[PDB]
Design a protein around this ligand. Structure first.
Ligand SMILES: O=[S@@]1CCc2c(c(-c3cn[nH]c3C(F)(F)F)nc3ccc4[nH]ncc4c23)C1
Lengths: 287, 254
């Protein structure tokens, strides 16, 4: 409570402060959660319960909880992957750092999924970086424990730019694939230092995808043409060459990215399989 | 598939999230009878507010974990289970019922303050561990091993799974994964004549031999089900939703 001396305000959603423990000297992130009428918010209930079951080098560590505001105490990392991309915009991020970072995100995500947890908000602003060159999944407020097989879950999930097509077309069921999509959209955004699918609307987002990966038909993605928001009027665009879409990226790089951006979620590559892809044959830990 | 990963993790966490077997004896002002009335009431709340079967299973686990290490008086048991259902709702449900609704169903027995102040207390005692494995979680896994999906078997096994939430004695003496084992075999045997699939013997390590003790208790429970003081679960599984499986004639021997 009184042990923490606030250094700076470092963001706002759901306010987050950088702070120091006055007795141990430890630097932390304080996520302040205001209550006051409805009790303890569903986002905090879910973020706390899930992070306590999720101990991974590549998942952000929750250090404590405090109760009329509620404070989440997390380990501090100085950088999010958006501020890092907006700093490498001109020069570009090095190939073997993109490979390290991807490899690490897939590792945390594999752990998440194997502990029956969906993130449902993978975007750069929620991925945190340290100085030793580690990256970590953050903001589990939009997460959820899921069953086998899944049942129908909240429709309004994932930031539009990273939203998976089966959510936009409003499939009754969605699962782990939707997080793999998100990382595909991220992988590409590191390679080409630009948002892959920066749509302003649910319709634009779909069309930006179709215009790049081609308009799905019953042969790519069986069942698609009878999905609740699929209209037969949609422009049938052709699939682009990945030479054009990710120009820098090697043959293995391309193979991994298409597999991560499959239309049919039952065919999309899993976090477990992705980790074993030949793209990851010579990984290191740069800075 | 990474199912095997999740199954291993659920089986591991069901032992850590399990309440203390005999905690009812330790309770001075409370009993199994009073617990069973509370649980039956939450089925009525569950069915009235069209909530998932997970939400119910989760609140009871929160209830038993809390009572395992907190003494409560009879005038307070309705507050604990209310605050339990509100949290299981906030966790599990796309549209969780709001506080003032959870108040209305107590009929103003307690205030908004009382319900909100008990939620804070229930989180503290449970140390914010809410992602506990339920009977339901294991059953839904077990259902993928029917060669022929049978919607009657599914509603009955679920039905049998809810019956045990009512009766501390003797279900607390069994792990969720085992109870679900009993409920599936008994549901399958009742409609088709078939038994515990080989594929689930491999997945779970449970033979019919290992399920015998839980099956014996669960069989009596199913037999004596229409004379139980508690009846909301039979009313719930009488709907066409669950194929009116509570009307089915139980088997006699096994
Ligand atoms: O703008 S806030 C600062 C980084 C950050 C964010 C968030 C965050 C992510 N998405 N949304 C937020 C917040 F809600 F704005 F706080 N969480 C954390 C958690 C730990 C941590 N350590 N160091 C930084 C962070 C952190 C995004």
């Amino acid at each position: 409570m009184e042990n923490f001396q606030k250094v700076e305000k470092i963001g706002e959603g759901t306010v987050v402060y950088k702070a120091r423990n006055k007795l141990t000297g430890e630097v932390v992130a304080l996520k302040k959660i205001r209550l006051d009428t409805e009790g303890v918010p569903s986002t905090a209930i879910r973020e706390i319960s899930l992070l306590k079951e999720l101990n991974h080098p590549n998942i952000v560590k929750l250090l404590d909880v405090i109760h009329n505001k509620l404070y989440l105490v997390f380990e501090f990392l100085h950088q999010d992957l958006k501020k890092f991309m907006d700093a490498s915009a001109l020069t570009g991020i090095p190939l073997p750092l993109i490979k390290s970072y991807l490899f690490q995100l897939l590792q945390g995500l594999a752990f998440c999924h194997s502990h029956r947890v969906l993130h449902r908000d993978l975007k750069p602003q929620n991925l945190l970086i340290n100085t030793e060159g580690a990256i970590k999944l953050a903001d589990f407020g939009l997460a959820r424990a899921f069953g086998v097989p899944v049942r129908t879950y909240t429709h309004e999930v994932v930031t539009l730019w990273y939203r998976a097509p089966e959510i936009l077309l409003g499939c009754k069921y969605y699962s782990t694939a939707v997080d793999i999509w998100s990382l595909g959209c991220i992988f590409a955004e590191m390679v080409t230092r630009r948002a892959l699918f920066p749509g302003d609307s649910e319709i634009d987002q779909l069309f930006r995808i179709f215009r790049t990966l081609g308009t799905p038909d019953e042969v790519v993605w069986p069942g698609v043409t009878s999905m609740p928001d699929y209209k037969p009027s949609f422009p049938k665009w052709a699939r682009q060459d990945f030479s054009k879409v990710v120009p820098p990226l090697d043959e293995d790089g391309r193979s991994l990215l298409s597999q991560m951006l499959h239309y049919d979620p039952n065919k999309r590559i899993s976090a477990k399989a992705a980790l074993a892809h030949p793209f990851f044959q010579d990984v290191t830990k740069p800075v | 598939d990474y199912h095997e990963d999740i199954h291993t993790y659920l089986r591991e966490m069901e032992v850590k999230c399990k309440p203390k077997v005999g905690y009812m004896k330790k309770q001075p002002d409370i009993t199994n009878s009073m617990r069973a009335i509370l649980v039956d009431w939450l089925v009525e709340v569950g069915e009235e507010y069209k909530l998932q079967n997970e939400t119910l299973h989760l609140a009871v686990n929160y209830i038993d974990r809390f009572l395992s290490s907190m003494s409560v008086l009879r005038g307070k048991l309705q507050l604990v289970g209310t605050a339990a259902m509100l949290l299981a709702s906030k966790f599990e449900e796309i549209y969780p019922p709001e506080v003032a609704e959870f108040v209305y169903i107590t009929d103003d027995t307690y205030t908004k303050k009382q319900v909100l102040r008990m939620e804070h207390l229930v989180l503290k005692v449970l140390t914010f561990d809410l992602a506990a494995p339920t009977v339901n979680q294991f059953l839904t896994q077990y259902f993928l091993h029917q060669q022929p999906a049978n919607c009657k078997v599914e509603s009955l096994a679920m039905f049998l799974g809810e019956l045990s939430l009512i009766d501390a004695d003797p279900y607390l003496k069994y792990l969720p994964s085992v109870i679900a084992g009993a409920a599936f075999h008994l549901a399958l045997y009742t409609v088709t004549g078939q038994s515990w699939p080989e594929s689930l013997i491999r997945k779970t390590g449970y033979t019919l031999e290992s399920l015998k003790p839980c099956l014996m208790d669960l069989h009596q429970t199913y037999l004596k089900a229409p004379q139980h003081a508690q009846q909301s679960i039979r009313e719930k599984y009488k709907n066409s939703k669950y194929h009116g499986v509570s009307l089915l004639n139980p088997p006699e021997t096994l």
